[PDB]
């Protein structure tokens, strides 16, 4: 019973590492994607306000 439970432990610990790495790479790609979404959505409100003032 012990040897079968050690083997299963090893396999689920390896899957847990393999997925924990995937989360961290997405979680980081996203602080990036959200930050470029926000740097983009500021530049505009300055350019669109700049548009409405130079149209006025």
């Amino acid at each position: 019973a012990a040897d079968e439970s050690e083997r299963g432990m090893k396999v689920i610990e390896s899957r847990a590492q393999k997925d924990e790495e995937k989360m961290e790479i997405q979680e980081i790609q996203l602080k990036e994607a959200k930050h470029i979404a926000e740097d983009a959505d500021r530049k505009y409100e300055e350019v669109a306000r700049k548009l409405v003032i130079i149209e006025s």
Binding site: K31, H35, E38, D39, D41, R42, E46
Partner: protein, 372 residues
């Protein structure tokens, strides 16, 4: 409606006042926190002799007046001149009569007990407001971001603060104050820009260095290999056109200015910087609450608006915090008004009615009543 419409929210700052009605999404009134006193006798065409000037008329006419700032580093230092800014806010800016409006005011982090009692004395006894309430600024900022536990890095015009808050109670012994903010930051840009070979000679040159700081300044992550980048000279440069043609270029200094917030040494300050201070606040708090504070670094204040401030802070504290920890730097877009918006929400709220200090409480308990 009696007071649903009727609650006022006045956030008193070192540089700006933000004011308006609880309910609104943003301040109806924003203006400098100055009180100008004319250096000479005379008049403007069509007006009478004016003893005093406040806000923008004091800024615009600054050449003939002696300008004074009532709030030094977030604390009210001159009460004669503050009652003047309040008067202006109610009567001219919001054009309301104060004696029928409940007023939510804000104070600073370790605001002396005696001050909270004094502005209550002036609110009730010289403005005769029905009821009032003083909220702590970081606490309204947090709450406006939905939560109740977190640590706010709050940074405006004269002060920076770190106020760790747990289930609403700001933690007195863990609060840190760093007297370097947006005011200090405009004057440093000034020098690195004259030092770029320029001259902000007339007052129309002075004022706009501040509009350069706001529009073009950045907080780079890896400020190290950003200077290095500056040198290879990429299309990192940025030219601004002055009141006239005089196109001034700012490439590099653009980020050397907010690197002052992480390195106070850029300005002859020996104090620690924003990120270390976030952290030190945190290793001054209870142990069990430190995972909470780390996942809830809420930013508020005009000077925390520099793009990429959050990414630099993100990486600044990850790399100081134990790896078992989750770091999370919340920086909302409306952050230059977080404080105010948190007050608008709270004061328009359904449950806040029972915390308003009324003239009944006051006339019966003395200023002590609201002081808590």
């Amino acid at each position: 409606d009696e007071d649903e419409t009727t609650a006022l929210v006045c956030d008193n700052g070192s540089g700006l006042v933000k004011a308006g009605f609880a309910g609104d999404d943003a301040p109806r009134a924003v203006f400098p926190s100055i009180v100008g006193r004319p250096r000479h006798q005379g008049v403007m065409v069509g007006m009478g002799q004016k003893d005093s000037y406040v806000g923008d008329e004091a800024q615009s006419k600054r050449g003939i007046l002696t300008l004074k700032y009532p709030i030094e580093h977030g604390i009210i230092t001159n009460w004669d001149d503050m009652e003047k800014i309040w008067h202006h806010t109610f009567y001219n800016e919001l054009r309301v009569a104060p004696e029928e409006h409940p007023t939510l005011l804000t104070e600073a982090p370790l605001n002396p007990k005696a001050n909270r009692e004094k502005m209550t004395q002036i609110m009730f006894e010289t403005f005769n407001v029905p009821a009032m309430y003083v909220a702590i600024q970081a606490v309204l900022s947090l709450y406006a971001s939905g939560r109740t536990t977190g640590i706010v890095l709050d940074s405006g015009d004269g002060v920076t603060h770190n106020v760790p808050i747990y289930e609403g109670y700001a933690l007195p012994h863990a609060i840190m104050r760093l007297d370097l903010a947006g005011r200090d930051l405009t004057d440093y840009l000034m020098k690195i820009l004259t030092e770029r070979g320029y001259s902000f000679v007339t007052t129309a040159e002075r004022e706009i260095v501040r509009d350069i700081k706001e529009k073009l300044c950045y907080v780079a992550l890896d400020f190290e290999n950003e200077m290095a980048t500056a040198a290879s000279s990429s299309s990192l440069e940025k030219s601004y056109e002055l009141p006239d043609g005089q196109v001034i270029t700012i490439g590099n200094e653009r980020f050397r200015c907010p690197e002052t917030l992480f390195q106070p040494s850029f300005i002859g300050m020996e104090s620690a910087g924003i990120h270390e201070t976030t952290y030190n606040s945190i290793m001054k708090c209870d142990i069990d609450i430190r995972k909470d504070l780390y996942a809830n670094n809420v930013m508020s204040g005009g000077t925390t608006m520099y793009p990429g401030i959050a990414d630099r802070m993100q990486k600044e504290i990850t790399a100081l915090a134990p790896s078992t920890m989750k770091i999370k730097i919340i920086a909302p877009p409306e952050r230059k008004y977080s404080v105010w918006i948190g007050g608008s929400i709270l004061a328009s709220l359904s449950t806040f009615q029972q915390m308003w200090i009324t003239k009944q409480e006051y006339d019966e308990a003395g200023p002590s009543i609201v002081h808590r």
